[PDB]
Design a protein around this ligand. Structure first.
Ligand SMILES: Cc1cc2nc3c(=O)[nH]c(=O)nc-3n(C[C@H](O)[C@H](O)[C@H](O)COP(=O)(O)OP(=O)(O)OC[C@H]3O[C@@H](n4cnc5c(N)ncnc54)[C@H](O)[C@@H]3O)c2cc1C
Length: 456
DNA sequence: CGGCTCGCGCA
DNA sequence: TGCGCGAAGCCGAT
């Protein structure tokens, strides 16, 4: 409804009804940013057509107890900057604590909202909140895909087996959906503390903090500055300094040649469409430009496709039949080593390369992309069962990665353990036909000793 | 039937 | 280091 630079294919109606006379309320969950936000822009256009103001509601759930301080501070500090950014545009931001299924419905009734808009996320918990909200509200409810360049329900209607099947589909719809972002218009009609919730949450997560021998924290919070503004600087530095050499050095953990955009992209502090727009105009190495675009467009959005069309995305049942049969037949194979969650967590294994990868995960919260494959695949090799390996890999990924609890993580773990979006390889013990990685293979691609010595 | 985001031999 | 084969099941264009 309404909009000249707005594609209607980015919005879908979750619930029909009579449009109320109150303000249009935007339920911000995934895209925590002010600029290049389709969901916020569409909420403004609906408000403009109805001559009502637009407001933003963020519901703080109990999910931060499962995660750590590193994710809590990163999200909270970005929200504090976001509050000022919306305030400059005369857009009020309301922060609620509790279950969104009950808090959002209460806010709609109390604030007398006219229309409700929310961003899209294929996670299981989001669909549970939406269904609860729908039964408690009586105004139209819309969903906007502000995370993907091409809407998830529009790119493909089925689960995609491999990237080479999804690649032609995505690139065919690029000329339509890849476009510039109109500026956010400030509100014409004007009508909890973020510091207190930060202090309250931190005290609850203090006992669960990872520590060293001398009770010293392992996490180093100066590597990534949270916030919308800092994410712009990371993109600018990557395009100017790192994008040219990305194609040749993205598989070398000893070189900081990655975009470092996943923590910002996970919380929606920067738009992946915005990154694509600046990358496309950038005149750099054609090989590196193609390599980076294949990651942020295909592999990032196919991860949303995997979780959207597979409700068991974090389970063994989502694996392909060939992988399940191979893993089933190799259940009784004697493992070379057996490690529990705690031994994996502290990095007390016989592999010095695996332990160094974990320390980078512990200290920085963002382990290098190449070593994540080795990190996850060796968990399967040294665990009781494939279910145990999937349980440990998901737990350590969500607990310590800044980009954890993301569709890119569940798809990545399933790729490493269950061969999702992959193919069969040579037959092996324990791991069967799942793709294999060895220490000697990494030794021939990068300086392993430098990586190991960098992280003890 | 062609071709997919590893190890390994060889220059 | 970069290149080409090997080992493996299956989708998708016909
Ligand atoms: C076992 C495992 C677990 C992972 N855990 C997570 C996670 O929790 N959260 C997360 O966001 N990513 C995860 N990834 C994906 C990938 O490792 C990260 O996106 C990347 O390492 C982050 O560094 P970067 O963005 O600087 O790398 P870049 O090469 O600069 O990545 C560019 C962008 O493309 C996307 N992308 C790149 N590689 C992948 C990939 N393999 N799968 C999906 N999208 C990709 C991301 O949006 C990323 O920001 C995981 C991968 C594996 C193998």
């Amino acid at each position: 409804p309404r909009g000249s630079h707005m594609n209607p294919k980015r919005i879908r109606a979750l619930k029909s009804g009579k449009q109320g006379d109150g303000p249009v309320v935007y339920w911000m969950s995934r895209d925590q940013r002010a600029e290049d936000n389709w969901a916020l822009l569409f909420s403004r256009a609906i408000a403009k057509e109805a001559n009502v103001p637009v407001v933003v509601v963020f519901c703080l759930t109990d999910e931060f107890l499962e995660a750590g301080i590193r994710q809590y501070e990163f999200m909270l500090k970005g929200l504090q900057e976001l509050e000022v950014s919306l305030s400059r545009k005369k857009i009020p931001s309301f922060f609620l604590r509790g279950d969104p299924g009950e808090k959002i419905s209460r806010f709609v009734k109390d604030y007398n909202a006219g229309t409700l808009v929310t961003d899209f996320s294929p996670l299981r918990i989001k669909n549970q909140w939406i269904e609860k909200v729908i039964s408690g509200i009586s105004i139209p409810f819309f969903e906007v895909d502000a995370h993907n360049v091409v809407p998830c329900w529009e790119a493909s209607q089925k689960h995609e087996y491999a990237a080479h099947t999804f690649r032609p589909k995505l690139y065919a719809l690029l000329p339509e959906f890849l476009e510039e972002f109109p500026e956010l218009e400030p509100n014409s009609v004007t009508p909890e503390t973020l510091s207190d919730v930060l202090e309250t949450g931190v005290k609850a997560l203090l006992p669960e903090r990872a520590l060293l021998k001398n009770k010293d924290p392992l996490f180093e919070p100066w590597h990534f500055e949270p916030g919308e503004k800092a994410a712009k600087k990371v993109m600018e530095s990557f395009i100017a300094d790192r994008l040219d050499s990305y194609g040749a050095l993205r598989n070398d953990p000893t070189k900081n040649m990655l975009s470092n955009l996943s923590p910002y992209l996970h919380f929606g502090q920067i738009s992946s469409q915005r990154v694509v727009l600046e990358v496309e105009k950038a005149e750099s190495n054609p090989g590196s430009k193609k390599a980076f675009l294949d990651e942020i467009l295909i592999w990032k959005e196919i991860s949303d496709n995997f979780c959207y069309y597979n409700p068991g995305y974090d389970g063994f049942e989502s694996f392909p039949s060939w992988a399940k049969e191979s893993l089933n037949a190799h259940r009784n194979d004697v493992r070379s080593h057996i490690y529990t969650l705690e031994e994996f967590e502290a990095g007390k294994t016989h592999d010095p390369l695996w332990n160094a990868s974990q320390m980078e995960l512990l200290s920085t919260g963002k382990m290098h992309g190449y070593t994540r494959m080795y990190w996850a695949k060796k968990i399967l090799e040294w665990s009781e069962s494939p279910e145990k390996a999937l349980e440990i890999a998901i737990c350590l990924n969500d607990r310590y990665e800044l980009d954890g609890r993301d569709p890119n993580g569940y798809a990545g773990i399933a790729w490493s353990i269950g061969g999702v979006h992959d193919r069969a390889w040579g037959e092996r013990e324990v791991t069967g036909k799942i793709r294999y990685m060895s220490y000697e293979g990494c030794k021939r691609k990068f300086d392993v000793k430098l990586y190991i010595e960098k992280y003890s």
